[PDB]
Symmetry: D2
Subunit: 312 residues, 4 copies
Amino acid sequence: DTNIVTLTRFVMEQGRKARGTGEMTQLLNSLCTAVKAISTAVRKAGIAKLDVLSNDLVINVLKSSFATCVLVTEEDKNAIIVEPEKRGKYVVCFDPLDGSSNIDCLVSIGTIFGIYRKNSTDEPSEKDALQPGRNLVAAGYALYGSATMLVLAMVNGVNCFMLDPAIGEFILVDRNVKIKKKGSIYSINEGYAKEFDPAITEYIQRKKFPPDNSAPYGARYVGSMVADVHRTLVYGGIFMYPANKKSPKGKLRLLYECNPMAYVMEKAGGLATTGKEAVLDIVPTDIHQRAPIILGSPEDVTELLEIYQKHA
Amino acid sequence: AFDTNIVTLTRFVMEQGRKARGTGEMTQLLNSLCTAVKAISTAVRKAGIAKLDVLSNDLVINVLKSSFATCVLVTEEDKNAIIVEPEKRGKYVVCFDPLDGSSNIDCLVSIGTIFGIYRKNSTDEPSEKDALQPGRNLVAAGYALYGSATMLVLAMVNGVNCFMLDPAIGEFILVDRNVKIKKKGSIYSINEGYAKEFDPAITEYIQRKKFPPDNSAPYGARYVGSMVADVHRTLVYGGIFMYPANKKSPKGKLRLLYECNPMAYVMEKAGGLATTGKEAVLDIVPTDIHQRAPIILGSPEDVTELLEIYQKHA
Amino acid sequence: AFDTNIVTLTRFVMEQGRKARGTGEMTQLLNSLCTAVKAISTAVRKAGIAKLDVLSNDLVINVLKSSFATCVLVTEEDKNAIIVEPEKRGKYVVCFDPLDGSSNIDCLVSIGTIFGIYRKNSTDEPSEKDALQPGRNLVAAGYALYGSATMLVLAMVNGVNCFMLDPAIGEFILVDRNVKIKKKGSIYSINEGYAKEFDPAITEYIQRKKFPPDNSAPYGARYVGSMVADVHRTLVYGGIFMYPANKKSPKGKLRLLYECNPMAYVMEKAGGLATTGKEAVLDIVPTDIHQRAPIILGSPEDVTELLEIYQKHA
Amino acid sequence: DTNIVTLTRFVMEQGRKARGTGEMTQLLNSLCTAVKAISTAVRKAGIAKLDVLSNDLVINVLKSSFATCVLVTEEDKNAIIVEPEKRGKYVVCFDPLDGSSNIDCLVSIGTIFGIYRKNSTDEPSEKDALQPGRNLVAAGYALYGSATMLVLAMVNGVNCFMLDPAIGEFILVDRNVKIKKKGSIYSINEGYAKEFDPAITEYIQRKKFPPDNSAPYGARYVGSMVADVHRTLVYGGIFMYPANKKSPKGKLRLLYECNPMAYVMEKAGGLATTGKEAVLDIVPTDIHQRAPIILGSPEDVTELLEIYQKHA
Ligand SMILES: O=P(O)(O)OC[C@H]1O[C@H](COP(=O)(O)O)[C@@H](O)[C@@H]1O
Ligand SMILES: O=P(O)(O)OC[C@H]1O[C@H](COP(=O)(O)O)[C@@H](O)[C@@H]1O
Ligand SMILES: O=P(O)(O)OC[C@H]1O[C@H](COP(=O)(O)O)[C@@H](O)[C@@H]1O
Ligand SMILES: O=P(O)(O)OC[C@H]1O[C@H](COP(=O)(O)O)[C@@H](O)[C@@H]1O
Ligand SMILES: [Mg+2]
Ligand SMILES: [Mg+2]
Ligand SMILES: [Mg+2]
Ligand SMILES: [Mg+2]
């Protein structure tokens, strides 16, 4: 239509309110170019490694935005420090293409990103990225499924923008997403049943065989964190990838999968914990350290936390 | 860049339907189905920026009528079968579900169009009786998945072939020829929310997947909740998919003519099994166009691990 | 939004080729030509970000061969006619120019694919002799224009129909049915750079357009320099298009089999005339597949204003 | 590819060099959203006035850019003054869809734009737009033909960007376009032959019947100024819409068709005159006043100017 709220018309007009420099806008704007390009690549990732194109694409658009100074990728052993000539105030942690093995099976996959602000006065460095997820200034993910959706949580809310392929623009579709208090779906890889700790195994049981003789919870697990979390967000429910004996630390990385999603959830009123501490309050020591994550509708994550410390 | 020898689905069915002195009518049918599949893929892709299942249903009916290749059409969204008018008739019976899982759009989980094609084997007037053939009698069956990519999988007598929509030229382009599922897999797909109603065969099977007796690694679980998504993942990576019988859905949930049989035929033409637990899904004589049936499809060796167990509980 | 009753070119030729108990082979031919036209439209649209005429030529030959509807193919880019192998043969002769004006891409002026389809009228082995029919014997002819939109115009026995490529679903969608050119127009299209070599008939005609004797307003001039662009503008707005004979190109520039005759047939099936200045272009017996011929096409009344003048100078 | 120079990566990096505020970038960025949307509309302007959508679209994206303050359209009787809350330093004169009657005949058409800077301290007003075309700070056009091309002339050169429909991004394809000195094509509506003034009619003659007994000039006239000027630019030649007795003032409007094109030509080394004065040096009195325009390769426009004053 004639006055279409693009993601840029939206981020630019909220940046004005902070009496800013334009860097958040430039950043998100260049990110989007990566997102549309990775989407087009996946919509034909059969007519003819994608990890790599994707990574180099995102590092590139972000360097050229004159808004970053440290960039942490799933794919890179050490953090990337941006050249002085192109530096800016933001720190971005991102996984450029999450759940990549799933592309053969046409499983929705996505790019996950969390942005921090470098606060110190010394040279850009890894330590600027070792902040609590609580201090993110913006986070979100783009989901490459039947449609390409970019969900963006900033200080003012969680918003959903959809890619309109006809004009190559992200259009604002859902404003100020709030999650449901309690929902009916539980999401978890039950093929690890024997590895699970006692609090999970009891919670699973009470959902399947509800003690109140009410409706059992439906199970859903796409196997791709973005598909599952986007689901937990728009429909409500609980998603869980907890520690187990094959992974006492959890599987999902703290800086670029758990803290962004957790920031998005808590901004929409959900909770996200490791079943012991809030995810967002964990203070990272390694830019690639893993975390247990349990996130979703509040009443359900809460029910799980009572089972956790009722077992103490 | 830009290839001169594009194998489109239309070209490919013609290098099958022609050597057989065949119809080439089939081709017109399928070419029409591709128009409906493309238009649904676009609507889904801008769904949140623009009911959809109904509109899909009307599209698939109009394109099918105008192929001059159908006489009877059964739909999930329609009671009695649609008997195509004589002017436009041709010999096939198409059974279809235009947008399985249409509830799931709001959460952007992949959904899809499933179809089974029968040939009318009679001298008579078309009537919905023409649709009630057992699955073994299918001439061609497959599905269209609307996901990160739009994939058309079409199984016909010789084998299963996958096609991907090249969004630029608007054509399904061949990407996997003569597909064959793994013999055994490492995944099982079932909604364990219904764990309470499950019949004993399944419960022992699932526990044997999770807690392996012969000390293997436990099978992973995966369950998208869209039939097409879980069937396609099972076809390419392998594994076992189960929507068995439980009490709340006592003869299964999935409809026989357009969901279970098309999948069962794609799956069996790719070397996998599809059973209800007692009999093969492709041998049930259909009685209501909307009759239901339980289905277990997947890698030969895992389906059979479940049949040994079914037999042990009768 | 999203229409359920899309009239695609494939549906439309089937509601022509079917009532006539026809081929439906024609349909397969045309469906293949649409695949080539779409792939060329995309390549042009990213041309400056990615020879093209050669690659177009190979595409059109492969898609045409695989329609199982051709036996002889003549091209601007090929010497002797391509005789399709027996395995793939069918009854038509397609004469085509895969990318007229391909020089003009660099300046982003619209260019296009022109085609004429003949039916082989003999019991013999295909040979390029099968291509040398006069234009009156064309079964179907039209063009694809790559411009601000991609338009396919297809003229067949009954009339001319325009189709526009819906870029989202990748399908030519009908947008003008049974087209008819204006009787008289207000535009003349000719390259007056060649004003020195022009034969006297034309020179008096042009001066009568610019400096009207019967005190009308002078005709406007328009000359894109791409045959398809100027023919299409003449078909929809009217007017007269002239690439007559001059000395530097003494029998005209435009080739008869695939440029002049397809246009002349579209134009005459839309109620306009196409002559060389002495005879109608649709009656010349072709002798070389690359034979040339002058053409004047356009609104009946203006072509005739020029023929009165041609006759007055013989 | 992975490091694709978008129009934004280009304008942003040249704006940095001026130690600017970001407004040129914001402006061109929002303009582009109009351009891609008008392109998509014309690529299906048959499967189902366009002037109007187009106009409302461009006024809208430009207001929301926080970079304009006066906007002059072909389509609007009076100038548009932007609301204070959304004002910025630039003045834009644009014709949103030039040659619109031509869409039925699938004639390439385009959006023409010229940007000035408001220099005075008083309230935004028409007079800020009444500047010489010599003072444009940026100008160009987007052409909606077989491809959508945006040609952009700024202080540093003329550059050509092409719309990649797959990613909805303008990619930089031709850097620092220079025109040919002399070319072989002349472009003009010869259906006005009797209305032409003597200098034109003689020039026409010497091209057709070259006095030097050399190659005659080829004639080309699409009837759509952008198609013809883009042609004159990339291939060289001369384009002419001079005064005649039906139009002693010319036809093409000074502020939004003649001055932008003339700015683009002179930046690529061509010339543009009314056959009496330079186009760019004309000082506008009415925001909609017309101008004779003759533009192209230098030697050819020059040849015409000698014929003009040889006739004095
Ligand atoms: O492993 P990645 O390719 O980095 O992607 C992350 C994915 O890794 C997990 C897979 O674990 P599992 O198969 O045990 O469920 C998913 O939950 C999640 O989407
Ligand atoms: O067409 P639907 O109404 O969605 O019904 C079938 C759907 O329901 C099946 C399982 O759903 P659930 O586990 O919620 O019963 C899926 O395989 C499929 O998408
Ligand atoms: O296929 P082409 O090499 O371009 O030859 C034919 C072209 O040449 C004709 C006129 O060109 P010119 O006036 O330059 O001779 C056009 O109608 C057409 O595009
Ligand atoms: O008249 P517009 O729709 O504003 O478009 C401008 C067009 O107006 C002129 C038409 O004039 P003519 O037909 O006399 O050549 C073209 O040169 C030019 O492209
Ligand atoms: Mg990851
Ligand atoms: Mg269904
Ligand atoms: Mg040609
Ligand atoms: Mg104009």
